[PDB]
Design a protein around this ligand. Sequence first.
Ligand SMILES: Nc1ncnc2c1ncn2[C@@H]1O[C@H](COP(=O)(O)OP(=O)(O)NP(=O)(O)O)[C@@H](O)[C@H]1O
Ligand SMILES: [Zn+2]
Length: 384
Amino acid sequence: SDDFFSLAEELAPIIKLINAMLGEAIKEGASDIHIETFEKTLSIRFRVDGVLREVLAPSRKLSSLLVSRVKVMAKLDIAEKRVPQDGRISLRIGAVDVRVSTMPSSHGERVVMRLLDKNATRLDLHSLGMTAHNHDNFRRLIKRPHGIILVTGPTGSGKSTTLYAGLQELNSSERNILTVEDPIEFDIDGIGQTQVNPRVDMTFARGLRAILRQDPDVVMVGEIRDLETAQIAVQASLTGHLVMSTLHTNTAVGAVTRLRDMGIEPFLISSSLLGVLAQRLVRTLCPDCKEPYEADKEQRKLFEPLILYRATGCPKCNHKGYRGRTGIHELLLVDDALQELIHSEAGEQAMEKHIRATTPSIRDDGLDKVRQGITSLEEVMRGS
Ligand SMILES: Nc1ncnc2c1ncn2[C@@H]1O[C@H](COP(=O)(O)OP(=O)(O)NP(=O)(O)O)[C@@H](O)[C@H]1O
Ligand SMILES: [Zn+2]
């Protein structure tokens, strides 16, 4: 039921159109949908496997309606027309994550729906691209009885993915693993998952307090945004729970800084923190069109002829010569000397200096993967 092109042949029905268009986009395997306004006409385009195409040019009159409709679905400001807006939608087709972005433009806000699959995001702990060392130390870390483990990085770092991987590795029936999320990304099975619900003042803080009355061995908090959730988090870790969470800081040592700045007692950070996994996503070079070169003298400084690889571009990729992505990481492990450094508020430079004797930086991690020709030198250097 409900074909986009049929419904297009007639000039709400604006709800049946949007759903049908989404439905047709998914049927075609399209990555993105574009609704744009031009002075004398309107335009709908679909991107499929790189290729962009016009699929419909309905009357200019419809533009304000299709824009509004996508807004209300993504939970946004119908009134606001002058500034960018970004919403989310979860939908069942017969499950699709659709990211909608709008934008002021010379004849009407432009809109794109980003349409991602829910499943390609579901990776296990050995499939995130951790090096053998990081993998080993991280697996030994999440198996500890109590303390806080933070997964950190900027937006798009893949922090939710590595939490889920970690939880799944622990998901035995000997453990009681409870979760509070905003929202839940999916169901794991074996793990009690709890969504934050603003509609009843069920916040991260309230939910996490409740979790502790359910006798958990491990608890996950979707993220630590305010002092209050940090306070409970730290108390939970100090009373025999293993706690896992995220911050959006930019370095492993910056996690400590962020915690202090938020107002957690420096001593209490130093006695609860087990470790901080800082993390970035780099695109993996398309193995089909990736081209070998010989590193020049300046590129060598960063590391016989040294063979690295470069992007290029082909149909099997599209926009650039990259298919897929992988993680690069830095795993901070707390020891006696570092506790002193945290407690004494020594600062980022002194903590980093200490950690380097044992652990390589995210850049070195990235550079190793460049060496292996998994990714380009550009892709690693641009985030650094
Ligand atoms: N190791 C990995 N390899 C490939 N893809 C990954 C990896 N880790 C995460 N991803 C994907 O990258 C996207 C970002 O991951 P997500 O787990 O949503 O990140 P995040 O940092 O938690 N997000 P946010 O805090 O909302 O910006 C998702 O679409 C995941 O599929
Ligand atoms: Zn390619």
